[PDB]
Design a protein around this ligand. Structure first.
Ligand SMILES: Cc1cccc(Cl)c1NC(=O)c1cnc(Nc2cccc(C(=O)N[C@H]3CC[C@H](O)CC3)c2)s1
Length: 284
């Protein structure tokens, strides 16, 4: 891991803030824009291990759809992790603020990028456990990159994860909820939810259903309905990600292949799944 001298880093604007540090937009020494995450003095041994552990994991990866680590400051205080800066922020908020502004082909291209990053992680034997649009970042080329790495810190730090242990119920596969079995196949389930988030421009999965109601619905066989304006092939793929039996789900290699083929023959995306209206408007 590259050790960066603190003189090389200029923090400029807060883009995120927790109890034990903040995330900043800044510049790294022409200077390049970076994101900078800090850990304030007084941190515990566990906080230090978790904090630097995220950088340790990220430093092992080199892929277009995985957030790139620039370096760390560990000799001086506060400690910092420095990464590339993703100008458009988190994917969930991005889509909610840009409702209806993209083509279907653009949305599917986002999903292909996410799937390629996840294929790489799975092949590298890294189980994400918290794949969700809120943990994808977007740059000024519309490239989506997987973020949020670590061991216990990932689910501990995510407010959407509630007390299995602490898990983000609406994104989590049944076996991970029931018996704590997190694998690349549970990440595939989560990817199906991400597909639904993207195609709905950031709708909250299951809407207002409670966590217990979501689990009951899934166990009874119910699944999220098709988004409006959703290609049939895309809805079919997300439904395959949500198979109860883990072994029946596609692997990320299969997902990447299908999405690639759909993008290469974009007319395939013009066939839409039927949308079930929740409102009836009748006029004579
Ligand atoms: C710095 C760093 C350290 C460890 C791991 C990682 Cl992945 C990173 N890098 C980053 O966090 C980021 C890289 N680029 C980023 N761009 C960016 C720009 C603008 C807003 C956000 C962002 O995440 N905003 C959040 C702030 C929290 C609120 O819920 C609203 C949504 C992110 S964050």
């Amino acid at each position: 891991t590259t050790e960066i001298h603190p003189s090389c880093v200029t923090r400029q604007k807060v883009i995120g803030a927790g109890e034990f540090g903040e995330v900043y937009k800044g510049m790294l020494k022409k200077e390049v824009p970076v994101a900078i995450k800090t850990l304030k003095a007084g941190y515990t041994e566990k906080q230090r291990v978790d904090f630097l552990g995220e950088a340790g994991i990220m430093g092992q990866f080199s892929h277009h759809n995985i957030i790139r680590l620039e370096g760390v400051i560990s000799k001086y205080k506060p400690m910092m992790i420095i990464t590339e800066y993703m100008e458009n922020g988190a994917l969930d908020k991005f889509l909610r603020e840009k409702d209806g502004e993209f083509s279907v082909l653009q949305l599917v291209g986002m999903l292909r990028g996410i799937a390629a990053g996840m294929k790489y992680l799975a092949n590298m034997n890294y189980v994400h456990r918290d794949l969700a649009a809120r943990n994808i970042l977007v740059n000024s080329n519309l490239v989506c990159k997987v973020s949020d790495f670590g061991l216990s810190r990932v689910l501990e730090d995510d407010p959407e994860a509630t007390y299995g242990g602490k898990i983000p119920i609406r994104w989590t596969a049944p076996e991970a909820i029931s018996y704590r079995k997190f694998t690349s196949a549970s990440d595939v389930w989560s990817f199906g939810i991400v597909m639904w988030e993207v195609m709905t421009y950031g709708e909250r999965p299951y809407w207002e259903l409670s966590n217990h109601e979501v689990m009951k619905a899934i166990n009874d066989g119910f699944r999220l309905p098709t988004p409006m304006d959703c290609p049939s092939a895309i809805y079919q793929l997300m439904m395959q990600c949500w198979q109860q039996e883990r072994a029946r789900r596609p692997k990320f290699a299969d997902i990447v292949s299908i999405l690639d083929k759909l993008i290469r023959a974009p007319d395939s995306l013009k066939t839409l799944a039927d949308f079930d209206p929740r409102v009836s408007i009748r006029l004579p």
